Design a protein around this ligand. Structure first.
Ligand SMILES: [Ca+2]
Ligand SMILES: [Ca+2]
Ligand SMILES: [Ca+2]
Ligand SMILES: [Cl-]
Ligand SMILES: [Zn+2]
Lengths: 15, 1289
């Protein structure tokens, strides 16, 4: 599950 | 003024006002009666009427005399002097009440002054003869013990006490050698048997509102009105107009048909109100004419009479003058009497339609039954009519001083309890039908004969309409209106005779010849076997014996018949469980509330589980309650009614009498133009008479064979509701009394309150039931009766057209310069049907209202209504159009159908020829939904330029069609000369996002006297003046089929096609739009149902030209701008729809379950989409700290940092294909997080700067969604676009 990968990217998109 | 004489039974015989009479049926054989002269010419013999009855038959026996009457026997009534005295004084009191108002005084004055002619049909024209039993009655004037010495008196009425059946009052006329003077113009001594205290009871189940509080509890009759009703018969008899003609005879050839004596029109006239309408115009005129001829007999006798052979003291000229006055004859200067046709017509109408029970009750403020044909309850005894605390001369029972004037409260069984007693059912005899169960000692239901359905036999009705007519220059039309202005009766100073009565004294009657009728009882029970389980059986199953302990409700009719503790119920499965629920002490009061309440809700159900159905009124449990008609308790009644209408409730479908109207023979007038034109005018006038008489004939049959069945159904429902109430009351009382005595003290319950709460809910239910059934009845008339008459009336018209036209052409020589004026008089006049108005045939305001309610219910104007109900379209309108769907037509159960390019892709409707007739002045509308495909990018000129028809209704190159030419939809009217009119609607084809291309919209075309109009989605789009065309033949077959020059690929989808026989108003159309737009389910972009597990592109109503794309480097949705149509054409432009990500809606749960793949409002979903050969999902961060935030799009996972649950919403209450998507904490909670939309976001930062749109969640949207009108443009409004064959880009 390479999903935290995406989480982190998301968290950097919103910030 | 009329004077009532006073006396006591024991007053001495004075040989003047108190005499010993030898009454007509005593026959000179034997015996004499002390008689009392209540007013001139009227006598009271306070003794039982024995004539034709056996002494034993005065006792209650296992038999009955008549089959309708609930019969009370008391052989002791009038067996003492004191009882006889009470009788006398009550009659005096009743007479006084009658004369207390003009109308009643005048009734008595007419009766007093309407002396029988001094003879009958056997008497020579040149003679008066008094020595006949219809004229003279003897008084014995000798003393007791002496040789009998008799003198004769003239009399008009003798009133006796009752015969064996006290409550069956009856007026009787004297037959001699098989003929009746009182039916042949002469009149004769009339006789009555009457009982003042044993009065009839009736209810008003069938009327609404009704009563501010205490209806519909049963009412007792004012014996003054009962008396006056019989005095009306005396009136008719004294004037010799009580004639026989064709009677109403019940059909008796099924077990459920009410058996009864034949009903003469004179009985229905006497009652009045709505009942004369059961006598056809044909028979009204037949009776009128008979009475007129009879009067021509008398006037002739009067011109010829010279002597009186039996009484030399009679003065011929005195009597000639009294009779002239009685019959309203006129006298010329030579002393010759003739009939003045006006004075006759007034006298007739006043005697038959003026003095009626209905009119007297109205004038006297007495309540009475609504019809000769109404149900009855058993008779009651009026304790004391001589007590002015109870009954008074001035106000009857309804004494304002005791607050009993309002709503006839003084007659109400439930309010004026102190006025009457019930009679012990040991003394009551009733004709019953014992219906024992058989199948294709058992269960046997006793049913009163009179509770059965009255259905008139077809032989009840006159076919005079079939006779020929002889049209002359002076020919006149005959209309006998059954009405008389009651206030003018009251004020006609010519009505009452100013001529003194001649002396009542004459010579003794020595000719006693008379027919005395003989009466016998017949068995009170008739046993029959039947396989049928209709109304009487279904009702019986809802009852239960008194001695039982622990009844429970059931939905199983059979169980209810078998088990004594099981009582049938037609309420929900679920009512039934609550009814049967046993609870602990503490919870009981609460349960009593719930169930009494649930009962009221159940009883009030008045709508229709499916909402597109096109039924205004329904009460859905009627089938289950009675099983009346065609198995109405089996299967969903609502569904059955949708398919087949009011008919399914009828136990019997009667066969109508609809005569072929006879031909006209037009008289010739060589050399007189004036008489030729008058013969034409008279022929046309007579045609209207035949139309009217025919409608009148349908109405007579409707009211006496259909509306009667419906009435019975109303009563049944009154009993059924009442049984359900009674059952629950017993259930409650039983369960309460099981509880410990202490438990019962801490349980607060009022049985009178419970009782009155239920009683209210029943009256609410019966209002709805009345409206529904009344509506059903008018519906049967208008759809199953009238049109079959109109078919024959049109034949008649078409035969008369030929006839009058041939006649104009034969006499053209004498129509020197008028022939074409007359050809066009006739053609124009006979071009339009005479419209049917119920108020011509009745002035019962109940019926008129029924009829007005119907005609102003737009849904009753539907003459074609194609719907899908089983693979298959069929016509639900009620007019039974034939519908043939061929194999190339695709049908689905969303009511959609697809017409393709194939030869076999067609539908043929064959309209009912008897309702489209309306044809020069158009007044009709057509409505449907359509889905027309997008143009094909490469075949663009054929789209733009090639017209094809889709629906075509043409007969002889005239009618109407709906056609399409590319982006245009066209309505065309074509008249009988081929002159054409058009109106059209064109949707844009250069629009970014079109609201019409390949999406369901709703079309309505309405045609009126001067405009054809197109509405789209409820809004008026265009309009064309259509005054300048002629007759349009609109009754051809309707052919649904693509017809033009079109590609194999061309097709069209339609749903809900219907036709109205009126111009729909804007309101109507907007309603229908809203109605037909409604769905439990959400819809996709094209207007089709939204579905789970199905690929969708996403469209945003607030940013039309924007679409979602997974950002490249990132797990978020960026917004992009839809590509335009990229090609040479200047005729078209659009934005691509098949772009952005491929989304799919998945079910969060599927649990509980269900079981189909349609998405519904408030469903909980996951919004997923395909990426890299995988399924990904749209989430929101749980803890975003701004008002909007980027959504997170990533593969499937249950991470406790993101909500995935989406609830799908439709906040717009007006029709729409947009829906919204709300993120929730989980399926359980009420907390709302935000709505999916598009927002702009700031892109950092050191590079270049800008804002950029993203797929987002927003809190702001939630603050606008409850606003009204809903903003269609908000960015949280989404629509889902699946690939569709109707859109190629
Ligand atoms: Ca009539
Ligand atoms: Ca009946
Ligand atoms: Ca039972
Ligand atoms: Cl809501
Ligand atoms: Zn009567």
């Amino acid at each position: 599950d390479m999903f935290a990968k995406l989480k982190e990217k998301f968290f950097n998109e919103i910030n | 003024p009329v004077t009532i004489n006073n006396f006591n039974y024991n007053d001495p015989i004075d040989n003047n006002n108190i005499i010993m009479m030898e009454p007509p049926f005593a026959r000179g054989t034997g015996r004499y009666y002390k008689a009392f002269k209540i007013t001139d010419r009227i006598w009271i013999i306070p003794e039982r009427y024995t004539f034709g009855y056996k002494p034993e038959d005065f006792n209650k026996s296992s038999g009955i005399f008549n089959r309708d009457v609930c019969e009370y026997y008391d052989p002791d009534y009038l067996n003492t002097n004191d009882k006889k005295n009470i009788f006398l004084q009550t009659m005096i009191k009743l007479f006084n009440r009658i004369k207390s108002k003009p109308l009643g005084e005048k009734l008595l004055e007419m009766i007093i002054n309407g002396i029988p002619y001094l003879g009958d049909r056997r008497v020579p024209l040149e003679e008066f003869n008094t020595n006949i039993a219809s004229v003279t009655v003897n008084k014995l004037i000798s003393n007791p013990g002496e040789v009998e010495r008799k003198k004769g008196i003239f009399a008009n009425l003798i009133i006796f006490g009752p015969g064996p059946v006290l409550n069956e009052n009856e007026t009787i006329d004297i037959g001699i050698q098989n003929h009746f003077a009182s039916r042949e113009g002469f009149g004769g001594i009339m006789q009555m048997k009457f009982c003042p205290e044993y009065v009839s009871v009736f209810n008003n189940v069938q009327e609404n509102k009704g009563a501010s509080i205490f209806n519909r509890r049963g009412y007792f009759s004012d014996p003054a009105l009962i008396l006056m009703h019989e005095l009306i018969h005396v009136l008719h008899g004294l004037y010799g107009i009580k004639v026989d003609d064709l009677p109403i005879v019940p059909n008796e050839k099924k077990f459920f048909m009410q058996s009864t004596d034949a009903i003469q029109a004179e009985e229905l006239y006497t009652f009045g109100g709505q009942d004369p309408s059961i006598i056809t115009p044909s028979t009204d005129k037949s009776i009128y004419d008979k009475v007129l001829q009879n009067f021509r007999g008398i006037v002739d006798r009067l011109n010829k009479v010279l002597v009186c052979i039996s009484d030399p003291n009679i003065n011929i000229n005195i009597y000639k003058n009294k009779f002239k006055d009685k019959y309203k004859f006129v006298e010329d200067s030579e002393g010759k009497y003739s009939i003045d046709v006006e004075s006759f017509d007034k006298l007739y109408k006043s005697l038959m339609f003026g003095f009626t029970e209905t009119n007297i009750a109205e004038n006297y403020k007495i309540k009475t039954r609504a019809s000769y044909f109404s149900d009855s309850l058993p008779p009651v005894k009026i304790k004391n009519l001589l007590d002015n605390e109870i009954y008074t001369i001035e106000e009857g029972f309804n004494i304002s001083d005791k607050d009993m004037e309002k709503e006839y409260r003084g007659q109400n069984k439930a309010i004026n309890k102190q006025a009457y007693e019930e009679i012990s059912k040991e003394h009551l005899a009733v004709y019953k039908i014992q219906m024992c169960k058989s199948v294709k000692p058992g269960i046997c239901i006793d049913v009163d004969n009179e509770d059965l359905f009255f259905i008139a036999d077809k032989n009840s009705f006159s076919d005079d309409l079939s006779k020929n007519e002889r049209i002359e220059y002076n020919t006149q039309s005959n209309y006998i209106e059954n009405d008389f202005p009651i206030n003018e009766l009251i004020l006609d100073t010519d009505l009452i005779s100013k001529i003194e009565l001649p002396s009542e004294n004459t010579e003794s009657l020595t000719d006693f010849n008379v027919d005395v009728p003989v009466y016998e009882k017949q068995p009170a029970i008739k046993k029959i076997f039947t396989d049928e389980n209709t109304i009487f059986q279904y009702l019986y199953s809802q009852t239960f014996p008194l001695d039982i302990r622990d009844i429970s409700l059931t939905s199983s009719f059979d169980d209810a018949l078998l088990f004594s503790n099981k009582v049938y119920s037609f309420f929900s499965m679920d009512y039934i469980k609550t009814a049967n629920k046993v609870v602990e002490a503490g919870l009981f009061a609460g349960w009593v509330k719930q169930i009494v309440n649930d009962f009221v809700i159940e009883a009030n159900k008045s709508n229709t589980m499916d909402k597109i159905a096109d039924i205004s009124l329904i009460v859905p449990y009627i089938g289950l309650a009675l099983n009346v008609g065609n198995e109405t308790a089996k299967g969903n009644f609502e569904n059955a009614f949708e398919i087949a209408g009011a008919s399914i409730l009828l136990e019997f479908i009667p066969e109508l009498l609809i005569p072929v109207v006879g031909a006209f023979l037009l008289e010739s007038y060589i050399d007189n133009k004036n008489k030729i034109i008058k013969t034409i005018d008279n022929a046309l006038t007579k045609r209207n008479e035949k139309w009217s008489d025919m409608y009148g004939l349908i109405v007579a049959q409707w009211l006496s064979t259909v509306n009667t069945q419906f009435y019975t159904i109303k009563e049944g429902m009154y009993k059924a509701l009442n049984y359900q109430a009674q059952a629950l009351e017993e259930i409650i009382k039983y369960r309460y009394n099981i509880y410990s005595e202490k438990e019962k003290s801490n349980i607060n319950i009022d049985f009178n309150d419970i009782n009155s709460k239920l009683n209210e809910g029943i009256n609410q239910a019966i209002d709805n039931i009345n409206n529904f059934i009344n509506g059903c009845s008018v519906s049967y008339l208008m759809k199953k009766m009238i049109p079959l008459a109109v078919e024959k009336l049109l034949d008649f018209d078409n035969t008369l057209k030929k006839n009058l036209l041939n006649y104009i052409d034969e006499n053209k020589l004498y129509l020197i310069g008028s022939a074409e004026y007359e050809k066009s008089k006739v053609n124009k006049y006979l071009k339009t049907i005479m419209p049917f108005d119920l108020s011509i045939y009745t002035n019962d305001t109940i019926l008129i209202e029924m009829f007005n309610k119907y005609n102003s219910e737009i849904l009753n104007n539907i003459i074609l209504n194609l719907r899908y109900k089983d693979n298959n379209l069929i016509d639900l309108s009620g007019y039974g159009a034939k519908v043939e769907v061929y194999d190339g037509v695709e049908l689905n159960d969303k009511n959609q159908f697809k017409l393709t390019s194939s030869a076999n892709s067609k539908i043929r409707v064959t309209q009912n020829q008897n309702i489209i007739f309306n044809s020069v002045f158009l007044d009709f509308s057509v409505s449907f939904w359509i889905r027309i495909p997008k143009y094909k990018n490469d075949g663009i000129q054929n789209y733009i330029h090639n017209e094809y028809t889709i629906i075509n209704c043409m007969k002889n190159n005239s009618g109407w069609k709906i056609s399409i030419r590319g982006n245009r939809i066209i309505w065309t009217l074509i008249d009988i000369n081929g002159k054409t009119k058009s109106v059209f609607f064109e949707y844009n084809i250069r629009e970014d996002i079109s609201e019409y291309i390949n999406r369901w919209f709703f079309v309505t075309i309405t045609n009126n006297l001067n405009n054809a109009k197109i509405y789209i989605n409820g809004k008026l789009e265009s309009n064309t003046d259509i005054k300048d065309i002629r007759e349009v033949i609109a009754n051809g077959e309707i052919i649904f089929k693509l017809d033009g020059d079109i590609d194999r690929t061309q097709f069209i989808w339609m749903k809900y096609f219907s036709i109205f026989n009126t111009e729909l108003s804007q309101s109507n159309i907007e309603e229908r739009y809203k109605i037909q737009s409604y769905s439990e389910y959400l819809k996709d972009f094209w207007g089709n149902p939204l579905m789970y597990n199905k690929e969708y592109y996403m469209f945003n109503a607030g940013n039309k030209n924007s679409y979602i794309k997974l950002k490249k480097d990132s797990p978020v949705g960026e917004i992009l701008t839809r590509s335009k149509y990229n090609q040479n054409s200047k005729y078209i432009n659009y934005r691509d729809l098949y772009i952005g990500e491929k989304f799919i809606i998945r079910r969060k749960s599927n649990s509980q379950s269900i079981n189909d793949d349609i998405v519904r409002k408030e469903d909980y979903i996951y919004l997923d989409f395909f990426n890299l050969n995988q399924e990904w999902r749209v989430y929101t961060y749980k803890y975003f700290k701004k008002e909007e935030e980027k959504l997170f799009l990533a593969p499937i996972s249950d991470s406790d940092e993101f909500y995935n649950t989406i609830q799908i919403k439709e906040y717009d209450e007006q029709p729409t294909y947009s829906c919204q998507l709300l993120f929730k904490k989980d399926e359980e909670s009420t907390d709302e997080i935000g709505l999916i939309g598009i927002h702009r976001f700031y892109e950092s930062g050191i590079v270049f700067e800008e804002y950029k749109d993203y797929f987002c969640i927003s809190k702001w949207y939630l603050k606008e969604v409850k606003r009204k009108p809903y903003n269609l443009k908000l960015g949280c409004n989404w629509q889902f676009i699946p690939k569709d064959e109707g859109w190629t880009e």
